[PDB]
Amino acid sequence: LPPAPRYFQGENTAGFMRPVRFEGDITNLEVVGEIPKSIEGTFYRVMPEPHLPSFIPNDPWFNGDGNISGFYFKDGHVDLKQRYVRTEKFVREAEARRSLLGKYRNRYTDLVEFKIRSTANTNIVYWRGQLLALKEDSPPYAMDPETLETFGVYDFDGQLPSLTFTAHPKFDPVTREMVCFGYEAKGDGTRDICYYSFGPDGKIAETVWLVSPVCGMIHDFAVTENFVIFPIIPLVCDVERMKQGGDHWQWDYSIPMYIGVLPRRGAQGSDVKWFEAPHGFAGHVANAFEDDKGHIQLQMAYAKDNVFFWWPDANGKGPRPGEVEAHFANFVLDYQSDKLPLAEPTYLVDDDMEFPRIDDRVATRKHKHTFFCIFDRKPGVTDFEFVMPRAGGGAPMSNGLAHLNHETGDIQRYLPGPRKLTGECIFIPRNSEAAEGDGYVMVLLANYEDMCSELAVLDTKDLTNEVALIKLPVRLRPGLHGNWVDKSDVDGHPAPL
Amino acid sequence: LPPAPRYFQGENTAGFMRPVRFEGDITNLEVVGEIPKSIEGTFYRVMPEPHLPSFIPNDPWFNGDGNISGFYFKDGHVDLKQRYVRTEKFVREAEARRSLLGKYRNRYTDLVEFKIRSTANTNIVYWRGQLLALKEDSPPYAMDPETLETFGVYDFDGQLPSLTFTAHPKFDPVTREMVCFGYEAKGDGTRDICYYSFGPDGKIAETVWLVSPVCGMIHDFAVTENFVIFPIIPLVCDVERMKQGGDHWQWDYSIPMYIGVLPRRGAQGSDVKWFEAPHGFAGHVANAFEDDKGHIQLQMAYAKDNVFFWWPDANGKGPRPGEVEAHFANFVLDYQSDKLPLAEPTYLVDDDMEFPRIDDRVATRKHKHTFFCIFDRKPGVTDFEFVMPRAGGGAPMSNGLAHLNHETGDIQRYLPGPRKLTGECIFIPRNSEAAEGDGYVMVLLANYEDMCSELAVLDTKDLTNEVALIKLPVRLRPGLHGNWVDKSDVDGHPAPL
Ligand SMILES: Oc1ccc(/C(F)=C/c2cc(O)cc(O)c2)cc1
Ligand SMILES: Oc1ccc(/C(F)=C/c2cc(O)cc(O)c2)cc1
Ligand SMILES: [Cl-]
Ligand SMILES: [Cl-]
Ligand SMILES: [Fe+2]
Ligand SMILES: [Fe+2]
């Protein structure tokens, strides 16, 4: 077998990116300031964190074992619980005491045959009394919200019709449905997309099979009252390339950014319309909604080149690290239109941004508040000379959060400091009668001075001030998505406005 | 109630001394070099580590909640498990989410009434299939060696005759007895010492009540074939002082360092002879044995002034931090002599030293190898300008280990480097046929450059070279005692040579 290294080497596991790999508890976290005493619930987040050194050099960040953190809040006190998802990969590698799964989404490089290749490392959501740890090449893994024990791969009582479950399901705050899909839904290289939904009682509602014009990456999607929308990143999969040891994904400069629109209820596969946006990268969706005219307003991060530069085109063509900016775009789509090309989007702000969140009480409906990560290169915002040598590589950087009020156009920015960077934020309603976007924002910080993590709590009335700073004595390696589960929401999701 | 701080403040919890307070697992630790594949067993260590900020300012290091680390070795792989002892203090404070126990060994300052005040933070030993977590003001707490679960306060099937159980019991390698005692054995300020022993079947053997000439601290003791030996530190307890909120211990410059000698078997309390060594501090015992003449050779760390400078005399008189050195002394004692004063000891080496260990296969018999911590002020051994600002306070410093061969007088020294300091080492026999002192040494390092801990593995054939360096991604705060439990030893202790 390729030899198993006994310590981590390479930029993707150096500095702040060095895996810690701890599971367990740290109760009664240290707090500077004061956590509002009325906050009650749990912030769950997932990070890729390789449990064992990979036999693949420079294995991307996206390929690390999912480790779940829960921060449990009550009466101004907070406890941390942390535990790895017991994926098939995790369990078999722990038994062997070495890495066995190979390149990102390429089973032809695995040292043993896996049934499920999930690292369950991308999102962690609440559904019907369980956590679902999500990875877009696989079904979810179900976990206990209290103990973080893994129950196992989850198939929705035998109803899951797809091999794949997106990391970005949407929760309709009025119908209480979970709206889902999977791409490559019949296996590696397939153009099959399975669109499906579950009612609040757990029964499958929609199931529609459709065909993507290319086998392209559909990382996120959008849901409105009457439509579902599938933006395709121009990364394309060729299984023959994979069989020779090549990458699952390869950029294609010759295609548009396709945007599929399907009717939300009762459609067939042939009802999808593949609109053609100008070539670019489909980033995360903030939210989509239908306006007065029935036109879809789709608000999402959008870049003009390949954000995932390590997967360049067939000739190795692509940008360099830190070159590509993504911007907060608004695309207008009309399902009734037969004109497939779309105009350049309008842009809501100037900032280089990503990881947008809204008040999920208006998900699928008109929203007027967005919170998002920003990366500002203006001199002095980040002390790059100090941070870069301690940061390692492989992951995006954010040096602030922004809050946009869409009615007024006011933007507030939270800057944690010159030697700190942020993860994705969560929004917590002040209480069940709070106005849209009124309450608290939490965000995990990487402090490069201390080489520790911190959890900042902010009030939306003034996003520039930390109400509390929870000081962890360990690093939580840069991670992906997270969600708030409020103690007053019996089904784990907030009530509609 | 005195207000409960929400983050740690003060020098005793700053820098490398900042509590981490994590419990759980880190498997498959990173290793540089190669752990000898034949090593099989577990290294257990205990550290004081306050679980909650104290309401007592500058609470000493000795007063922190005991947290147990186990490093489990097999086939060149090593896993960490870590867990707090579930003492009455730990459990009641965790329930209240605040500190409740007050000053070190002063129940009159507690905010609630405790039955048992143990922090179980001083030693962790193996006995008859359980771990015993030891603290000299209390009985032991029994724990599971595999899971580190706490079973509860342990009374030896109702046989424990004392309120107090020493942190330094001795294991006789020939008889397989555990030889114990407790001082202040009838309560705060009592001069009662209870000497007692257990046979390998768990039945109590000896129980002798004796009287100390003063209520002084008897931290360690020594055991030979026919005698037990009690060296008294000139810290003295006055319960009336404690009732007014004062310190349990106060130095007394007017007394000798008493050394009690009692016959090991069949004695009465009045058989003890209280020899009088020159005034000084009774440090840890390496080992004691009877020579050809039946005279006791007692080898121990010995200083000329109060090592515990924060507990000065009645008028506040005593040394400053880092001024007192302890040296490796040999006292000669003759139980038949009626001459109570003893000569100044001889010294085995020059180094400022402490935490001596021997090959416990010769415990209570003649030994010819000692391993110990040293603190060398020779310029450049420690880069004090770098280390001191990151170190915090409250704990002793060691910047090397030394191995003395007593037959030849050769000394080898392991220096982990200018920005590292060490804990107490353990010795592991190479195999069951190894000569005395031949095998491996392990020691936990504090790395002040990385602010992480490391576990060094050394071969006694060349103590200057690390065979392996196990790299933890967290800090283990400076700790107290630790022990090896070899997998090949049925009762957990090595066979006699
Ligand atoms: O297995 C995978 C595949 C993709 C991702 C992932 F987070 C993609 C992604 C990351 C970004 O920083 C922005 C963005 O729009 C998308 C994670 C795991
Ligand atoms: O409650 C307690 C009381 C004492 C100790 C302790 F380890 C004392 C000690 C520490 C030294 O550095 C040298 C030495 O000779 C003795 C630990 C906990
Ligand atoms: Cl589990
Ligand atoms: Cl327990
Ligand atoms: Fe995502
Ligand atoms: Fe000790």
Q: The tokens 């009592």 sit on which residue?
A: B190
Task: Give nearest CA residue, ligand 1 atom 18.
Answer: A62
Within 8 A of B19 by CB-CB distance, chain A residues are 473
Task: Give nearest CA residue, ligand 1 atom 12.
Answer: A396
Contact B30 A23 (CB under 8 A): no
Tokens of A496: 């509609």
Q: What angle do CA B275, B280, B282 make, to 5 degrees?
A: 75
Cα of A92 to ligand 3 centre, how many Å? 13
CA–CA dist A345, B200 (Å, integer): 81
Among A122, A165, A421, the mutation site with the greatest number of ligand 1 atoms within 8 A of its Cβ is: A122
Cα-based distances in Å from A127 to A154, A197, B419: 12, 12, 50
Counting one residue from chain A and one from chain B, the pairs whose CB atoms sit within 8 A come to: 77
CA–CA dist B249, B313 (Å, integer): 9
The answer, for B91 touching chain A at a CB cutoff of 8 Å, is no
Task: Give nearest CA residue, ligand 2 atom 2.
Answer: B62
CA proximity to A83, closest of A137, A13, A145: A145
CA proximity to B359, closest of B409, B399, B297, B405: B405
How many Å is the Cα radius of gyration of chain B? 21
Within 8 A of A6 by CB-CB distance, chain B residues are 30-32
CA–CA dist B209, B220 (Å, integer): 17
Residues with CB under 6 A from ligand 1: A 62, 122, 135-136, 219, 283-284, 301, 354, 396, 480
Helix (H) or strand (E) holding A95: helix A88-96
**Ligand 2 in reach of B352 Cβ (< 6 A):** no
Cα-based distances in Å from B120 to A90, B101, B138: 35, 14, 8
State how far Cα A83 lies from the chain centre.
19
Q: Which residue of B has its CA nearest to A93?
A: B28
The answer, for B20 touching chain A at a CB cutoff of 8 Å, is yes
Tokens of A495: 């009530």
- Other beta carbons within 10 angstroms of residue A457's beta carbon come to 23
A389 SS3 class: helix
The answer, for B103 touching chain A at a CB cutoff of 8 Å, is no
CA–CA dist A427, A41 (Å, integer): 12
Sequence positions preceding breaks in chain A, C–N over 2.5 Å? none
Cα of B122 to ligand 6 centre, how many Å? 6
> β-strands B452-459, B462-471: how paired?
antiparallel
CA–CA dist A443, A416 (Å, integer): 10
Cα of B356 to ligand 4 centre, how many Å? 31
CA proximity to A235, closest of A62, A113, A17: A62
Residue A402 phi/psi, 5-degree rounding, is -125, 145
Q: Which residue of B has its CA nearest to A15?
A: B450
CA proximity to A121, closest of A61, A174, A180, A78: A61
Residue A194: beta bridge partners? A182, A209
E strand spans, B325-478: 326-333, 346-347, 353-358, 369-374, 400-405, 411-414, 420-422, 426-429, 439-447, 452-459, 462-471
User: How close, in Å, is residue A29 to chain B by CA atoms?
Assistant: 8
**Beta sheet of A257-263, edge-to-edge order:** A222-223, A227-231, A257-263, A273-277
Are the C-beta atoms of B389 and B472 separated by less than 8 Å?
Answer: no
**Ligand 2 in reach of B401 Cβ (< 6 A):** no
CA–CA dist A165, A155 (Å, integer): 10
CA proximity to A214, closest of A167, A265, A253: A253
**Ligand 2 in reach of B164 Cβ (< 6 A):** no
Residue in B19, B52, B451 nearest the CB of A451:
B451
Q: Which residues of A191-205 are buried (b: 16+ CB within 10 A; e: fewer)?
A: bbbbbbbbeeeeebe
User: How close, in Å, is residue B77 to chain A by CA atoms?
Assistant: 8
Residue B384 phi/psi, 5-degree rounding, is -60, -35
Helix and strand totals (H; E) in chain A: 3, 34
Q: The tokens 């999102």 sit on which residue?
A: A123
Contact A7 B30 (CB under 8 A): yes
Residue B461 assigned to a binding site: no
Residues 25-84 of A with CB under 8 A from B: 25-28, 30-32, 51-53, 77, 82
Helix extents (H) in B118-265? 239-243
Residue A96 makes CB contacts below 8 A (sequence gap 6+) with none
Are the C-beta atoms of A220 and A230 separated by less than 8 Å?
Answer: no
Residue A192: beta bridge partners? A211
CA proximity to A104, closest of A152, A50, A154: A50
Helix and strand totals (H; E) in chain B: 3, 34
Cα-based distances in Å from A175 to A19, A120, A147, A211: 41, 27, 29, 27
Residue B9 makes CB contacts below 8 A (sequence gap 6+) with B53
- Burial group, residue B106, by CB count within 10 angstroms (0-12, 13-18, 19+): buried
- Burial group, residue A85, by CB count within 10 angstroms (0-12, 13-18, 19+): buried
Are the C-beta atoms of A38 and A90 separated by less than 8 Å?
Answer: no
**Ligand 2 in reach of B117 Cβ (< 6 A):** no
Residues 376-395 of A with CB under 8 A from B: none
Q: The tokens 């005593």 sit on which residue?
A: B318
H, E, C per residue of B138-176 = CCCEEECCCCCCEEEECCCCCCCCCCCCCCCCEECCCCC
Are the C-beta atoms of B53 and B128 separated by less than 8 Å?
Answer: no
Residue span of the structural domain in which A145 resides:
1-497
CA–CA dist B251, B305 (Å, integer): 9
Residue B250 phi/psi, 5-degree rounding, is -145, 125
**Ligand 2 in reach of B60 Cβ (< 6 A):** no
User: How close, in Å, is residue B120 to chain A by CA atoms?
Assistant: 19
Contact A28 B51 (CB under 8 A): yes
Cα-based distances in Å from B395 to A316, B13, B27, B96, B255: 57, 11, 29, 28, 26
Are the C-beta atoms of B108 and B245 separated by less than 8 Å?
Answer: yes
User: How close, in Å, is residue B32 to chain A by CA atoms?
Assistant: 7
State the total domains in chain A: 1
Residue B167 makes CB contacts below 8 A (sequence gap 6+) with B122, B123, B134, B135, B136, B219, B220, B480, B481
- Give the single-character DSSP code of A417: -
Contact A22 B22 (CB under 8 A): yes
State how far Cα B496 lies from the chain centre.
23
CA–CA dist A179, A364 (Å, integer): 10
Phi-psi region of A158 (alpha: psi -120 to 50; beta: other; left: phi over 0): left
Amino acid identity, position A236: V
Residue B390 phi/psi, 5-degree rounding, is -105, -5
CA–CA dist B455, B474 (Å, integer): 12
**Ligand 2 in reach of B103 Cβ (< 6 A):** no
What resolution in angstrom units was achieved for this structure?
1.9
Are the C-beta atoms of B341 and B328 separated by less than 8 Å?
Answer: no
Are the C-beta atoms of B229 and B222 separated by less than 8 Å?
Answer: yes
Q: The tokens 């940061």 sit on which residue?
A: A391
Q: How was this structure determined?
A: X-ray
CA–CA dist B223, B211 (Å, integer): 18
Amino acid identity, position A51: H
- Give the single-character DSSP code of B239: H
Residue B414 assigned to a binding site: no
E strand spans, A9-122: 23-26, 30-33, 41-48, 66-74, 77-84
The answer, for A473 touching chain B at a CB cutoff of 8 Å, is yes
CA–CA dist A251, B375 (Å, integer): 60
Cα-based distances in Å from B429 to B40, B181, B441, B494: 11, 28, 9, 8
Neighbours of ion ligand 4 (CB under 5 A): B 86, 149-150
Tokens of A289: 């909604």
